[PDB]
Every structure is written in C-alpha cells, then in structure tokens.
Design a protein around this ligand. Structure first.
Ligand SMILES: C[C@]12CCC(=O)C[C@@H]1CC[C@@H]1[C@@H]2CC[C@]2(C)[C@@H](O)CC[C@@H]12
Length: 241
C-alpha cells in the first residue's frame, strides 16, 4: 500500500490562525486572521506538494504554477474535512483558534460563501468519504487547474494526473462505478467554490490596498499575480464531467 502510506505520512498536521478570540468579531480582525492563516497554510501546502509521489518529475516552474493555482481548492477541501470531523459542519473549522459560527459568518461578510463551504463539508458525511478517499481526492485537486496555454512540460503533467486518477480508482476498488461517479462529481464541485473565494480574495485585496492595509506577503503576491489569471480565464479548472 505504498501510495496511501505516502499520503498519510505527508499529510499536514494542525495549523493555527493566530487569532485572538478575546477581541470582538470585526470584519478587520476576522479577515486579518483568515489571511494570516492562508499565509501559514501556504507554507505547508508547498512542503506537502513537493513530497507527493512524482511531483518532482514536473518542471520546476510548473511545480510552482500548479501550487499557485490550486491552493484555494486544496485549502477549502481540507477545511471542509476538518469541519466534518470536528464540529460535523454547521460551523466552519478554519483552524482550532478560528472557528466560524453564524455570527462570524455574517460579520466577515462572506455568509453565502461560508454556506457553500458548509455544504461541501457536509458532503463528506452524505457520501461517507473515507480518510483514504479524502487523501487521494485532495492530491488530485493539485493537478486539476492549469493555464489554457498548457504548462512548460504538459506531457509529464498529463501522465502524473492520469496516475492520480488511477490511484483514486484503486482506493475505491480496494458498485465501484457509482462511487467513482460520486467522487468525481464532488471533486468537480470544489472549483466553483474556489472561484468564488478567489473573486472575494481579489476584491478584498484591492479594497484593503485602497485603504493601505496590507495582506501577508505571499498572499498579496499570489492574489495580485496569479489569481487574476484565473479570474480572467487564462487558467482554467480541469473538470471530469
Ligand atoms: C484559504 C482560507 C484559509 C485557510 C482555510 O482553512 C480556508 C480559507 C478559505 C477562505 C480564504 C482563507 C485565506 C484568506 C482568504 C483568501 C481571504 O482573503 C478571503 C477568503 C479567505
């Protein structure tokens, strides 16, 4: 069971937001802690992706491109898993120190996005997603969004992604047809959610820049340099259906 040994071995542990839960829930304080949490999780996503079977086959620039396009889908998918297992999804478990209740969903001004994220979370229960299935699905998310113009070595990407699909099929097989349909439909459903949060993240970065409040450095760079390629359609998700 080589492949699964690796995914479970490299899975990131707890990541705290740094949030001061004793100060009031303002828009500013909630988003400052969300953004800091993003910066911190980005570190772990980079280290996780580089340790994935086959990932270093990819040209070095494609390695960074793929991380820099898929991070939102990956982080939302993982957050949904955390929510499912820790508060069974009527709250959002961004981090142990940053759990969103309904009030925080409203004061962050992202209630409707949180409602979709909460729906994604609950699907882990509706579909009875196993830990092995979650891990394989999350790895596939890294290979599920690319420039329409292709990567520097697209061929290696296409083969690696093929191999991760084969692994997803393996864990299922180890009816199977309905299960693969269900899981590929779930995967496809992550991307519209990611896109909404990408739009949100971009809009807030412009607005906070207007009033001279800075995002953490990597978040500011990815949201100003890479996210707009997604919002403008130069980078697109790869769907199953
Ligand atoms: C990825 C994060 C942080 C990590 C996580 O668990 C999911 C969550 C999804 C919303 C993102 C947030 C990082 C900061 C963002 C991008 C804010 O700018 C607006 C939307 C937030």
């Amino acid at each position: 069971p080589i492949f699964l040994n690796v995914l479970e071995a490299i899975e990131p542990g707890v990541v705290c937001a740094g949030h001061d839960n004793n100060q009031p829930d303002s828009f500013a304080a909630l988003h400052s802690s969300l953004n800091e949490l993003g910066e911190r999780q980005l570190v772990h996503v980079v280290k996780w992706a580089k340790a994935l079977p086959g990932f270093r086959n990819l040209h070095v620039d494609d390695q960074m491109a793929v991380i820099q396009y898929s991070w939102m889908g990956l982080m939302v998918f993982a957050m949904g898993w955390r929510s499912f297992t820790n508060v069974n999804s009527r709250m959002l478990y961004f981090a142990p120190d940053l759990v969103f209740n309904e009030y925080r969903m409203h004061k962050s001004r992202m209630y409707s996005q949180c409602v979709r994220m909460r729906h994604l979370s609950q699907e882990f229960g509706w579909l009875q997603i196993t830990p092995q299935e979650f891990l394989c699905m999350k790895a596939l998310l890294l290979f599920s969004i690319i420039p329409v113009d292709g990567l520097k070595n697209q061929k290696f990407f296409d083969e690696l992604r093929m191999n991760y699909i084969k692994e997803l099929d393996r864990i299922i097989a180890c009816s199977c047809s309905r299960r693969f349909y269900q899981l590929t439909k779930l995967l496809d459903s992550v991307q519209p959610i990611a896109r909404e949060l990408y739009q949100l993240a971009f809009d807030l970065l412009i607005k906070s820049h207007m009033v001279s409040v800075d995002f953490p450095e990597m978040m500011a760079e990815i949201i100003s340099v890479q996210v707009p390629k997604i919002l403008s359609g130069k980078v697109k998700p790869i769907y199953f259906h």
